[PDB]
Symmetry: C3
Subunit: 512 residues, 3 copies
Amino acid sequence: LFAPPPRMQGKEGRPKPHIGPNYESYVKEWAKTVGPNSDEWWAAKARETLDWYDDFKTVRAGGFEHGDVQWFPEGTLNAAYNCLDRHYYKNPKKTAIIYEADEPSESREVSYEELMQETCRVANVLKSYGVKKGDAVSIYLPMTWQAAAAFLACARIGAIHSAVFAGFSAESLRDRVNDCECKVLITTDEGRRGGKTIATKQIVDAALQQCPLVENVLVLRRTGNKVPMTEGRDKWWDEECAKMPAYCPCERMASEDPLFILYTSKPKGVVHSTAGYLLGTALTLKYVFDAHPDDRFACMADIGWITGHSYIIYGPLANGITTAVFESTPVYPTPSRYWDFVDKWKATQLYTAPTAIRLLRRMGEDHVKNHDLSSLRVLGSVGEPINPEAWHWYNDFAGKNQCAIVDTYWMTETGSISIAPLPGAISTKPGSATFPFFGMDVDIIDPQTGQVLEGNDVEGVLVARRPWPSIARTVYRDHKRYLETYMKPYPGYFFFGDGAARDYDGYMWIKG
Amino acid sequence: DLFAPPPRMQGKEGRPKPHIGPNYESYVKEWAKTVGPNSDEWWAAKARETLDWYDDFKTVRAGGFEHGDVQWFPEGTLNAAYNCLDRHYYKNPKKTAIIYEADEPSESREVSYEELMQETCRVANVLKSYGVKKGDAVSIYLPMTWQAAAAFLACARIGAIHSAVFAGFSAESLRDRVNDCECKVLITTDEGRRGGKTIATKQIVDAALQQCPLVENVLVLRRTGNKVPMTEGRDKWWDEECAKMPAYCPCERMASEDPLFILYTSGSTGKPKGVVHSTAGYLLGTALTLKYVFDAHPDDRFACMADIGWITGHSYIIYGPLANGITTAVFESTPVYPTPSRYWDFVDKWKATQLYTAPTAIRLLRRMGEDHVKNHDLSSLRVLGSVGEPINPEAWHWYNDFAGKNQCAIVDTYWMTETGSISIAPLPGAISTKPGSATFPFFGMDVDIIDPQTGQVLEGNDVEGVLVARRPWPSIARTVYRDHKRYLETYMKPYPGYFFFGDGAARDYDGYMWIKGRV
Amino acid sequence: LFAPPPRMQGKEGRPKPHIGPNYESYVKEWAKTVGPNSDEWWAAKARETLDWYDDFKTVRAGGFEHGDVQWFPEGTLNAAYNCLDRHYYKNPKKTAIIYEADEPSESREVSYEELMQETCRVANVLKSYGVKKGDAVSIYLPMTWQAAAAFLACARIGAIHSAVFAGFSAESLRDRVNDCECKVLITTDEGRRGGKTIATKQIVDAALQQCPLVENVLVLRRTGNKVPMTEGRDKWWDEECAKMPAYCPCERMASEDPLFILYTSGKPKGVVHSTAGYLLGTALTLKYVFDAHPDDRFACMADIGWITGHSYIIYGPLANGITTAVFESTPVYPTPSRYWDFVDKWKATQLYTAPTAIRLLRRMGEDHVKNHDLSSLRVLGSVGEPINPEAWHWYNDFAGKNQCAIVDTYWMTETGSISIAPLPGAISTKPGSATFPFFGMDVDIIDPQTGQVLEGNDVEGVLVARRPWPSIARTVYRDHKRYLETYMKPYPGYFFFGDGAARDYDGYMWIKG
């Protein structure tokens, strides 16, 4: 058992945590988000967190049985307005994105004004291409800052953006593009990762050789090298954006209008809504990572996954804080890249994967010992349960026994973090996700009998009793597959698909 | 021959108290506020309590008969599907919305608001996937199954204009209506079942579509499951398409004067004309008429035995009853199948509180004998209504004596497709009825009798002429589809300053209105 | 120095001026419209002047550097609703347009109800053609009243209308139509001006022979003479409008959605204006610069093919709910007394003409003007080139009989509305001077040789604007780079008008010296 460190207790000049200082406060706050009278809490949080064009009347409706979950159905809003405009109107010169390029000398800060102008130009280009509200736009982009714009531009005009990981081959890209039935694709000529060149344009051409519906391609000049260009179909990002105004009006979108499609690695196109997903990600980033207005969040993931969707673009920007876009690899040029970045930009939170931590552990302790890293307050892990060795190395070297280790468990269909300790309230056990988040009422079911186990020291499958705002709403044009995968195995519950155990203290352990 | 309201309509025997009553002066006091120069306040208040608005309105009414620019609450936005399904589903998802009385009595079942809303959302998602945008036209060729309602509201959910065609029409009439409405999506069934007989609906659709080049997508509902021809690409199954869609669909925020539906006349030969009805005014009129004329209450079970292919099915089977949040009945059989006692068997089975049928069916049941009706209970009924030609005194007395057992109020209603809702009818809790009389006009309707030759308004009682309306009402027809000149010529030019119903009318000594048939 | 006349002092039964009676009152009012504390004044004026479907939250944002000027971004409204619908609801029988035809015997009044019904029919026709929100519609129309309706029709459904001056040749019309990429063109069979016939449909056919994107043409029967008609492509205005209802719902449009494109006369550039800011600017300018009152009859003798016709014939006067004049003839047809005959017949209270017309009327002699009454006029305005002192004095002596205020106005297509002009009830005028800038305009003089702002009076240089104003142009259509180079690059941090200016010892502004 590791109590919260002094940095997370509001000492040494650090901001006081939102929830604390013990387990009782967390349980008192969490009891309001579930059960009989959670509607008032969720309505207050929704009206406090987001800006609405039209206010809503009903809080929640629907259920698991037919996949008709609804949250704030009567309200209208826009994700791009909540992530860009309302922050640009308040502090245009505040930094929104710290772009850590592949080569450290090319790193620079991007202000909210610059990101908003780029987003508006891209949205104008998309509208000129004929993209309407509810259309699909494919995005095949590497980890550059403009990718964020390419996301928000879609959310600005009501288009549904489908991100494809830049490392995917031509076949997977073709499958996802064909399934989403998009007509516009946004990509780069080449990408740069770890000193290596990714031929994104060549793969895009190979895939589009079998994609009849794609008519317009927008190519970003990331490196400026010679790449083939098909006349008429493909146009340069900069040349097209130079013709458009730096502002574009925001479409007024219903809360249940789809925001993006994310294909799981026939692929499942997971669909998320606008208001519920945005509210869930904003609340999770604010509370689980104890984000504050002047914080500098750093998530070392890729925008082609749900982690990059939630905790690089939508989450941090909805809160109006600085987020980091990291393009390199953890061991380029030297295995000290992460700590050099942290010391260079004074990052306050860090969010990486267990694999990177294990690789850095195998690389030695002569790349972390001589680093300051005093700005960090929270160290997070995402993707797999962490083993004690990596957890302790993370606590001892990355945090210098002074940062809270937040091990989070979630998946693409939950939208945001489901189970994770609150850094200012929960004492952490190495390798445990501890307790569920707001709006999440999870339990353990016997797989053989289907009944719900009661008490502590139990083990079974992990299920959720009631829907939460950021839950996935459907699988794109395959709702029957959605119901079969998530609702049919255990009626009345949402099936995560992972085993879970509850120890004597009530902590939840996820089995790999 | 004057019949006072019965004890069932007086709040006795445990029945709910009437909305308006108990005498004629009470009706007059309420009706005086709905007409004249100071009726804006009453209509604004009624619109704000009756319907749920996304955006509030500022102006109540504008326009007139001269140029056909009638406007009601122009600045407000709302949705008909939200007012008919979503709010009631949020209030009580398990309440029954539709009692589906199938052709075979053993196949009848209840449909809840949740199930209807989910089906409507799936169909709306399918229509959106087909590329239907706001303001588009969708033709509906369906028999009296409950899913037909799920089709109607589906269009109303996405802002499409639905055009219903009666299932008994031939291929030529269906082709004419489809070609005139210029639709690209058609909704239909494989077969229909009525009175134990099979309607080859899909065969007629296939025959008609050979001369309808603009139709690209056909959605076929599997009502019976028998083998019917299916064109690849064009025709898709209802269940298979709806299984791929989510059970929810956001509601389009629609202007008050955005067209709600197109209804073509019953002309089997020639050029049918499409009466166009808007959203807010028509919905308000039908809701108010169903609440007051039939004295509908939240727990009532309204039963109208018309067809959804006509205006009666539009107003008092789907829109009117569901906008009030009550249970409505969808009746698929005929009055004499399997036995001439089907209506009373249905009434006793589902304990319907109100009945709304046509004089022709009542006359047929009269000629079929008294042995089929006199042995039923029928105590749940409080109101018996008649829609169509004025009911003759003989049929009126038979209806009073046997269907209501001299304990139900008989409400003879006069209206047309162009009026949207009931224009002249007695209030059951306030007005004493005479056999064969439409009594007094409804709220917002100020009717007079004009001499057909001189064109002057006949003041006083004991007069006879043509029936006209002085000022527009919320549920009036707004135009004839792409033929506004025909609309003006038919309804506005014959008597300038008045709306021409096209029927003769006589006002007797007591002021009761008697309809004398076509001019 | 000419003090305001008694007619502008609230005497002889004339309405009291909005701003007056001296320069100090004008400066006191104008100090609120510029600086760091102008947001409250602009928000109050926006919420008082226009009707909004949804209220706005932010007042202004953006700047000159990147061409991202924003005004009231979160609000929604409609220009057709503000110009037609609310006035029609308030008073349907009030006259909106006085149509002075080429033949004076064919002149007649158009009520607000009639204009609204015509606009609704045309909007329904446009919707039937498949025109969506944000589409471009070309308008090649002469100075008939229906043209105004057409404009508002494009505003009612959210389309972007691009007006082309009726005297343009086939090549210019083809270039503008091709650049705007429209699919619908609204035109007439023939126009009538000065007793002469303009073959409008012939030029339309010649241009459309090289315009592949146009599919629907709507032809208005102005004269009824026989003109060529292409089957399918061309349809008559009256026959199409007879099939549609006389009402059409208004699209709820964002404040920063484009309202119209106006090409300047290299290749033509399409100046783009927004909805809320341009409408507010024109309404305020018409209300204050011309001292318009609810019962006034404004008369502007410009053409709807230019920015003057856009701002002070259609949008500005109708947004205020007053009567505006659509003049089809020429100043010298049938006789050089046409302007004064029109003024005496319709009792116009304000007049807005070009210096060239005044010079021509001077060359025509005095016998045509000295015997008219003209007592209804209160304001005489000039639009275009700076007026000479001699023409100014002739205008003051004969048109106004030394009892009307002369308003010299300086502006351009990219400003949207009047930038520099005297307030008639507050400012004393000098012959040939634009006096002082309007509300929201903060203009200085920059020495072109050094690029530094000249401080003090009795200086001369180029005229620049420090901060954006609501009615500023937002971009050049599909050529934003050209917009930035033309208006924002030569002097960074300032908007470059492109005209010389001088400031005398009294602080008055003298355009081009």
